[PDB]
Design a protein around this ligand. Structure first.
Ligand SMILES: C[C@H](N)CC(=O)CC(=O)O
Ligand SMILES: C[C@H](N)CC(=O)CC(=O)O
Ligand SMILES: C[C@H](N)CC(=O)CC(=O)O
Ligand SMILES: C[C@H](N)CC(=O)CC(=O)O
Ligand SMILES: [Mg+2]
Ligand SMILES: [Zn+2]
Ligand SMILES: [Zn+2]
Ligand SMILES: [Zn+2]
Ligand SMILES: [Zn+2]
Lengths: 277, 277, 277, 276
């Protein structure tokens, strides 16, 4: 339904994107804060946050996460800061889990292992359980990341076992990873229906990597889904035309939502939908 | 694919819409010409044409069709004028077929019978064959209208029997009629896949009646489909806000196509895709 | 789920099938009673009944329907006798409605109009309402016949208007009619999912005409659906091999259900599922 | 439901235990006896894992040769497909080496996934190494797919010329805890997804545990081929342990006979799977 409020998430930095490809990539807490302000003004209500060292290397340092979180909340106190527990491929699970200790409002929870480009993004079943238990210990709301159909079933089993008790649960379909399910329209339609069958009360969002950004976004617009965009997932505005800011990508989605009459969620509505109150 | 040229059709008048509900409805040839020019400038490449008497009653008069066609050609000679052979529900089949004698570039060919609101839109199998023979007699390219899954199979059988020889064939999915298949995303995805299985070389467009205009349009945008809009099908710009003009509906679709980088077909490209050149 | 009880319906005679193609076709009430007993023993719990005159002509005579109903009830009182309100294409709606006055446990209710072979099977919206009101008047439970996606929506609107109050409602997908939706696996999967979305509490069965009998039956077996078989819909046991009787077609489905461990509904369970108690 | 049906019997596997399934064939002679009964019941392919006498999964070349020779002797016409999957946690080097035995066919796992409490690892560089060995040893692969994304990954290996097999045989392995389930919606989605991404590919389905019956009956009427057996499912009915792999094969053959779908002859199975 294209009248339910739309939540836009900006995945502004990520762990893979470089300035070789996207020179406008925000790397420092100050750059991330400036980008978060422009994204919030463009319509984003959530920042999906990865941090980097000054040299651009991915980081898991708690004091660096605090620096970025502080800089963003000082410029836009209303935005929801969602910490990544995914980090860079190959990072140790202990370093990935530890920032839950900063007690953010929300953080991601990756629901399975998959080949990821030339490497493997590992989420051992015992570590998924350890992380789900840590979400309860640190009192953080999860965004559950799903890259394949089978990950929805795996999450439904963790719900049945009482390991994931978050209700309503927010699921993010991450489509277009080389090794994961693509963002073709048939796949997004299949995933939302599959999720409705297996976890009927779950809410959902979609992140369309690269070329899949536009097809996933426009389908989510008219099916009641929420949308993630940003340099972490896609650096192009048009084929061969880099976007000049994460805010440009957010603003296009907000303009399309305005065209079709789908309202953007207020910060209050975004916290209500995602059960962050 | 959202890189293939987009053909926008404006169904500007129709047989059911009234001036009482939509005061901006073009009824006279002069009003239809003014609307067609504004629609073409907004991005439309096809006008789906029904005619009316000055009092708003649906008409099948050949002089009135000639007047509307000439008035539109006078101000926008590049637009494709597609005559309706559907007309008003209950109209005699003889009166529905006769305007093909005007040798338009294109005309609609309804592929089956269905309950339509409180009445029945009748297309007897023998009359569908008579109409297909008249299209060939007057060298008119059809737009085959389908309202249900079974109409695709019925068209595939007419192709197998050598009754429909148009190649490539252009199919329009008309979704949202009370009595026909709705325009929900699941249905449009099903129909394009069903059509690919049964008539692999067919091209397609979608008309989303009323509330289905936005979901059908945005799915067609990113799946390579073409789109029909207009007062015949939908009088609202937003929920509860009746639109200013057909051009206002066309312009929104053109702006969304520009946002996502899907080019609008030139008149030459539209004629090539629809095999009118 | 392939463990919920399976209801088998035998459509033993119909209005189209001839003795010239199928010499085992039961035509008289005595032949229909003998067939119904053999079908019940093979696993059928419902008889879908059309009647014929002694010369094989389709009939709508109430005395002839009473004779067939009484003959079947005398030899197999546990079977559910479902009378057809569809009859032969082109029959008057008054003659089609009249047998509801015999107060059968169940009867079919055709939910829309469609081209049917070279003719049109007409179900005017006002007549569908008249029929649905007559079902309630005579305390007859309907089996709602749907041939296309749009007919599910039309039934959902009759439920919303309080015209169809039957809860749970039993829908039968009639697939493979020339002019209607085919019985290909994609279509049956689409229809059960479409029905779950639009009428969530409805139960369903499938009738796969001719070549579609086996694909529809095996999909329904493992998706919790119920199945109709019989000479009305298909006269062949294998491609080009005429069946010996309706009981032969029923027995195969019962054997497949036994193989996979799906229990056959007892007469008591069939009446509970179809809300005939 | 008229195109010939190929039935594969996955008779042993690496996970199933004798305690849960006392009829589990473990030794080459037990595997040969089972393969003969399966062939007579309608199987045209044996999906083979080997075990040591103590039931532990094995990768020993002499043990694979013993099992292959024993099966070959009792049923020469059956297609022996060796597993390159082996047991979860087995080294990739040990998993690849049996291709040197030049079997008629072997499995090629197309991706990594969580698998029960562990992870079934197929590193992208190892998938490439394995696909290259298939070409060098002139072995026809059966490509194992557990998720939608693995179809796309296989399409990319075809584009890169790493997989040159044409037509390519894909097996959907559905119902693994961690992988895509075998519900009817999923099998319908996968066959359509495969037709879109690899149009000339043929396919089979393996429905683990509770998914055996739904996957089998959908494949029966959609032209797909079917895998059954103790590796994937030990029950004949819910809570009723199966008596042999041949019992599971025979049920599928009886259902195929009921609906008039012919079973592939050994010659037809080799033609469809391009083993000639
Ligand atoms: C492998 C990806 N960099 C992990 C990721 O970005 C998902 C998350 O943020 O939780
Ligand atoms: C019954 C419909 N008003 C006929 C119609 O509008 C379709 C067409 O133009 O061909
Ligand atoms: C026109 C159809 N032969 C009528 C029919 O057989 C459907 C029903 O029984 O309700
Ligand atoms: C993890 C499974 N035991 C590996 C397997 O059985 C797949 C194959 O045979 O190629
Ligand atoms: Mg005049
Ligand atoms: Zn991330
Ligand atoms: Zn029209
Ligand atoms: Zn009938
Ligand atoms: Zn295996």
């Amino acid at each position: 339904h294209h009248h339910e409020p739309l939540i836009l998430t900006a995945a502004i930095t990520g762990a893979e994107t470089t300035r070789a490809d996207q020179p406008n990539l925000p790397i420092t807490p100050e750059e991330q804060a400036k980008e978060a302000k422009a994204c919030f003004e463009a319509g984003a209500r959530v920042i999906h946050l990865h941090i980097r060292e000054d040299d651009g290397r991915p980081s898991q340092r708690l004091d660096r996460f605090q620096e970025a979180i502080s800089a963003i909340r000082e410029v836009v106190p209303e935005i929801i800061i969602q910490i990544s527990t995914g980090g860079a491929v190959g990072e140790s699970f202990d370093k990935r889990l530890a920032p839950l200790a900063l007690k953010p409002e929300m953080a991601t929870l990756n629901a399975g292992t998959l080949n990821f480009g030339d490497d493997i993004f590992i989420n051992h079943p015992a570590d998924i359980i350890r992380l789900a238990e840590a979400f309860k210990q640190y009192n953080v709301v999860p965004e559950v990341e799903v890259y394949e159909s089978g990950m929805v079933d795996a999450v439904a089993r963790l719900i049945k076992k009482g390991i994931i008790t978050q209700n309503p649960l927010h699921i993010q379909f991450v489509l277009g990873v080389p090794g994961g399910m693509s963002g073709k329209p048939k796949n997004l339609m299949y995933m939302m229906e599959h999720l409705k069958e297996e976890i009927p009360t779950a809410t959902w969002a979609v992140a369309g990597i690269g070329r899949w950004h536009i097809p996933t976004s426009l389908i989510a617009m008219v099916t009641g889904g929420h949308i993630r965009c940003g340099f972490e997932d896609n650096i192009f505005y048009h084929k061969g035309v880099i976007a000049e800011s994460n805010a440009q990508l957010v603003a296009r989605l907000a303009r399309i939502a305005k065209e079709i009459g789908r309202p953007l969620a207020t910060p209050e509505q975004a916290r209500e939908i995602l059960a962050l109150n």
